Design a protein around this nucleic acid. Structure first.
Lengths: 100, 89, 94, 107, 78, 85, 93, 103
DNA sequence: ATCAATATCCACCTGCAGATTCTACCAAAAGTGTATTTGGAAACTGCTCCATCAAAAGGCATGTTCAGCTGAATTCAGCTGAACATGCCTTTTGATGGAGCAGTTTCCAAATACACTTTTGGTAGAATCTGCAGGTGGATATTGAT
DNA sequence: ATCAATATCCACCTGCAGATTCTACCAAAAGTGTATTTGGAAACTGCTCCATCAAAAGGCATGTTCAGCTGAATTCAGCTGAACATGCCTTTTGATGGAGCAGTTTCCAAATACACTTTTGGTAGAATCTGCAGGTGGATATTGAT
C-alpha cells in the first residue's frame, strides 16, 4: 500500500478556507510581545504596557498584514502567477502609498 | 515618437483637457446630482476642479502603468487601471 | 475612591433589544459598537465644526449637523439618517 | 415641576443631554443650538440600529443568539455602504470575508 | 457629453503618466473613472454650496470637497 | 532588570506568516516573502509604536495604554475598533 | 473688502533665504495654502492632545508634541529646535 | 514698542497665529509660548521650501519661483514629499520619470 | 560603429505687455498696562494592574526528504495601436450688458449661555443567569490514485 | 467508474466563564430665571457670470499601412508544498510584590478681561521690470543602409 499524499495546493486551499473562516490571532502572543517591547525599548527605556495595548497592536498588525497579503496576491495574479514574491509586496505597498 | 511625447508632456504643467468639454461635463454632473437646479460656477471653481481631476488621472496612470510593467507588458490595459483603483482602495 | 467610566452600552443594548429582541451581545462586540459611536460622533461633530467655521458662524445648529451627515454618509444611509434626525428634531420642539 | 428628558421629548434611546455635553466639551464651536444634540443623537442611534440589524442577522445565520465581533465584520463588509463608511476601520477579532480568487481553484 | 473628453486628451494625460502604449479600451475606462471622481467631488462641493445658502459654486467649496476626501489642492485659497 | 530583547522579529515564524497569507487568500508562497514580511511588519510596528509612545511621553506616563495605541492607529489612517472601553 | 494672508511673511522669508529670487503670484498662492494646511494639522493635533489629557490650554508643549507626531523625522528635529529656540528667545527680552 | 514676532526673532506673525489659535476652536485657553512656537515651526518649513524652490528655479536658470519649482523641490525631497504626499500643487505638473523598461 | 540624412530638442535671443513691486492711506488688529481669576502642577497617597518567575502539558516550529508543478525562458504568428495627412467643427477669445447674486450693514425677537437648585438616570459592584466552547462520534463529502 | 483515505460537517450534550440583571448612591442632566448674543430679515451695491452672439483659430476626427507586441504553445530545471519525527517554547495559571496610574487638595505662575494707544497689513493705482510669445540654429536623438 502506497502512503497517501495530497497534491501541491490541496492543503493550501484547505487552509485558505479554514483561516478565512476564523478570526483568532495568527502570530503567537509571546513572540509578538517581545517584538513590541523591543521596538518600544528602542524609543524610550523602561516602558510598561497595558496588556490591551499589546492586544491592540497585534489586532492592527495582523489586520494590516492580511490586507497587504490580499493586495500582494492580486498583484501576483496580475502577472499570471500563483506564487506571491517580494516584488509583489513592494508593488502593493507602492500603489497603497506606503513607498516610493 | 512616444518618448518625445512623454518627455514633452512631463516637462509641461498646463491643463491637458480642453476647458469647454470639461466645464460642460462638470455642470452636467452637478445638475444630475442636485435633482436639476440652476447652479452657477466660479471660473476658479472649475479650474480647481480640473486641476484636481487631471492630477488624479495622471497619478492613477502612473500606478496603473506600474501594474502594466509588472505584467511584462508596456500597453496599459483597462484591468491595469481597475486593479490600481482596487489596491488604492 | 472609585472611577466612573461612561459609555454607550445601555443605549446600544436598548437599540439591540428593539431590532433583535432575542439577541444579546458579547462585551467585545459591545466595545466595537462603542468605538463606532465615538468614531461617527467625532466625524460628524468635526465636520459640523468646520462647516460653522467656513461660514463665520459661532453656533453649531442641527443644520450644520445635517450637512455634515450628508457629506459623510454614503447615500441612502445619509437619506435615512436625515429622516430620523429631522423627525427627532421636529418632535423635540413640541 | 416634573422632569422629562430630552431623549423622551425627541423619541430617542440615545442620550441627548450627554451628546450635548460632549459637544460643549469638545470645543467644536463657541455655542451649540438646541436641535444639534437631538439630531446628532438620532443619527448615531440610527446608524447603530442599522449595524445591529445586519449583525443580528449574521448571528442567526450562524445559529448564535449573541452577537460577536465576527458578526459585525460580516454585516459591515457584506453591506456596500456600511463598508464604504467604515472602509478605513479595523474590527478587532472580525476576520475577513471568505474570498478565494478563482484562478487559484483546481481546474 | 462625456465624449468631449477626447482620445487625444486622454492620451495626453497618460503620456504625462509615463505610459508608452495605450489599449484602445482605455478611453472608455478613463471616461468612467473621471465620471466617478467628478461625481464624488461635485456632490460634496455643491453640498458645501447649499449649506452656505449660495447658488454659486466657489473655488473654496471645491477645495473643501477635495480636502475632506483626502485630496488636498493647493493654490485656490486653501 | 530583564534579559535584553534582541532579534525578536525572528520570533515571527514562517508558519505564522504563512497563516496570515492564507487568511489573505494566498495559495503559493515564494521562499523569500518571510524576510520581506518581517521587514514590512517591523516598519509598521516602528511607526505605530513611535507615535503611541509619543502620546505616552506627552501624558508624562511610563505605561503605554490601549488609548495611546488607538490614537497612534487613528492618526496613521488605521482606525481600530474595540479597545477604548 | 478685507482678506488676510501670509504673503508678507513668505516674501520676507524668501528675501532672507534667497534675496535674488522672486515668486509668482500663483506660487505665492501655493505657499499660503501650505502655511494654512500645516497650521491646521499642528493645531488640530495639539487640540486632540490637550483633550485626551483633560487639558483646556494649548501650550507650546502641545505644539511640540504635535510637531513630533506630524513631521517626518529630521524635519521634526529642526522644527523642534526652531520652536524651542524662538520661545526661549521670546521669554527673555 | 516692538511686536512679539520681533521679540522671538521671527518674520512670521505671532499675534496673528495666536488670534487664529484663539478663534479656531482648538482649546479654551492658549499659552503665551504656543503661538511663538507654532509661528517658528511655520517659518522654518517655509524657509526650507523656499530654499529648495529657489535652488530648483535657478537650476532651470529662472529668477522667479513658480509652482513648477515648488513641485520639483517638494517631490525631489523625501521628507517634504512624505509630508505633502496627499497634496496636489496646482500648475506644478509631475516629476520627469520614465520607467527604465521603456528605454 | 559609421556616417548619412532627417527631425525635433534646447538653449538663447528681443522688446514690451502684463505681472509685480512701490507708495500711501487707514480701519482693523496687535500691543500695553493694569487688575483679577484660575487651570493645573506638585505633593501627597490608595489600590489597580503590571512585570517577571515558575512549572507542566502539549501544541506547534523546525528541519528533512522529495517530487509535482510552477515560473521562467523561448519561439512565432497574428492582430492591435501608433504614425501618418487633411479639412472641418468644436473650442477659444472677445464683449455687451443684463442680471443674478454674492457680500455688507443695521436691528431686534428668538435664541443660547449659565449659576442655582431639584431630581433621576447611569454606573459600579454584586447577584443571577445561561449561551456556547469544547468535547465527542458518525455522516457526507472530497480528493487522488488504480 | 470506483474505491480507500482523509477531512470536513454537523448534530448533540453540559457547566462555567462570561453576559444579563438587580440595586443604591450620586454625579450630571433637567428645570428655572435672568443675562448675553446672534444670525437672519430687509434694503443697500459692484462684481463676476452667463446668455447669447459672435467671429475664427487650431485641435481633433477620420481612414490606411505597418511595425512591434501581446498571447499562445511549449519545455525543463529547480523551488516550494506535503508529510514526516522531534523536542522546545508557548500557553496557562498563579504567585510575589512593587510601580505607577489615578484620586484629592492646595495655591501661584500663567491665563483672561478690558480700556486704550500704537502699528500693521491690505489695498489700489502708479511706477518698474520679468517672462514669454515666438524666432532662431546647432546639438542631440532617430532611422536606414553599408
Amino acid at each position: 500500500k502506497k502512503p497517501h499524499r495530497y497534491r501541491p495546493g490541496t492543503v493550501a486551499l484547505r487552509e485558505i478556507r479554514r483561516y478565512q473562516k476564523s478570526t483568532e490571532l495568527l502570530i503567537r502572543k509571546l513572540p509578538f510581545q517581545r517584538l513590541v517591547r523591543e521596538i518600544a525599548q528602542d524609543f524610550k527605556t523602561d516602558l510598561r504596557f497595558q496588556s490591551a495595548a499589546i492586544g491592540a497592536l497585534q489586532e492592527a498588525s495582523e489586520a494590516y498584514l492580511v490586507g497587504l497579503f490580499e493586495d500582494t496576491n492580486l498583484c501576483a495574479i496580475h502577472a499570471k502567477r500563483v506564487t506571491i514574491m517580494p516584488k509583489d509586496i513592494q508593488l502593493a505597498r507602492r500603489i497603497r502609498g506606503e513607498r516610493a | 515618437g512616444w518618448l518625445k511625447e512623454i518627455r514633452k508632456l512631463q516637462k509641461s504643467t498646463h491643463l491637458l483637457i480642453r476647458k469647454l468639454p470639461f466645464s460642460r461635463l462638470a455642470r452636467e454632473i452637478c445638475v444630475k446630482f442636485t435633482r436639476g437646479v440652476d447652479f452657477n460656477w466660479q471660473a476658479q471653481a472649475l479650474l480647481a476642479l480640473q486641476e484636481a481631476a487631471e492630477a488624479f488621472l495622471v497619478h492613477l496612470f502612473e500606478d496603473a502603468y506600474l501594474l502594466t510593467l509588472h505584467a511584462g507588458r508596456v500597453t496599459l490595459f483597462p484591468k491595469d487601471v481597475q486593479l490600481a483603483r482596487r489596491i488604492r482602495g | 475612591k472609585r472611577s466612573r467610566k461612561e459609555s454607550y452600552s445601555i443605549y446600544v443594548y436598548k437599540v439591540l433589544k428593539q431590532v433583535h429582541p432575542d439577541t444579546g451581545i458579547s462585551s467585545k462586540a459591545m466595545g466595537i459598537m462603542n468605538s463606532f459611536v465615538n468614531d461617527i460622533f467625532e466625524r460628524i461633530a468635526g465636520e459640523a465644526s468646520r462647516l460653522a467655521h467656513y461660514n463665520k458662524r459661532s453656533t453649531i445648529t442641527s443644520r450644520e449637523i445635517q450637512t455634515a451627515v450628508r457629506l459623510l454618509l454614503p447615500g441612502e444611509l445619509a437619506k435615512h439618517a436625515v429622516s430620523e434626525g429631522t423627525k427627532a428634531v421636529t418632535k423635540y420642539t413640541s | 415641576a416634573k422632569a422629562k428628558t430630552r431623549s423622551s421629548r425627541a423619541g430617542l434611546q440615545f442620550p441627548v443631554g450627554r451628546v450635548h455635553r460632549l459637544l460643549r466639551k469638545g470645543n467644536y464651536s463657541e455655542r451649540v443650538g438646541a436641535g444639534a444634540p437631538v439630531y446628532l443623537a438620532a443619527v448615531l442611534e440610527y446608524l447603530t440600529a442599522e449595524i445591529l440589524e445586519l449583525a443580528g442577522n449574521a448571528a442567526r445565520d450562524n445559529k448564535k443568539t449573541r452577537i460577536i465581533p465576527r458578526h459585525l465584520q460580516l454585516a459591515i463588509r457584506n453591506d456596500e455602504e456600511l463598508n464604504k463608511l467604515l472602509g478605513r476601520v479595523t474590527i478587532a477579532q472580525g476576520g475577513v470575508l471568505p474570498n478565494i480568487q478563482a484562478v487559484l481553484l483546481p481546474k | 457629453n462625456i465624449q468631449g473628453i477626447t482620445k487625444p486628451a486622454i492620451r495626453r494625460l497618460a503620456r504625462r503618466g509615463g505610459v508608452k502604449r495605450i489599449s484602445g479600451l482605455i478611453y472608455e475606462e478613463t471616461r468612467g473613472v473621471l465620471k466617478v471622481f467628478l461625481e464624488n467631488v461635485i456632490r460634496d462641493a455643491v453640498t458645501y454650496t447649499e449649506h452656505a445658502k449660495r447658488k454659486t459654486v466657489t473655488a473654496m467649496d471645491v477645495v473643501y470637497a477635495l480636502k475632506r476626501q483626502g485630496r488636498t489642492l493647493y493654490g485656490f485659497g486653501g
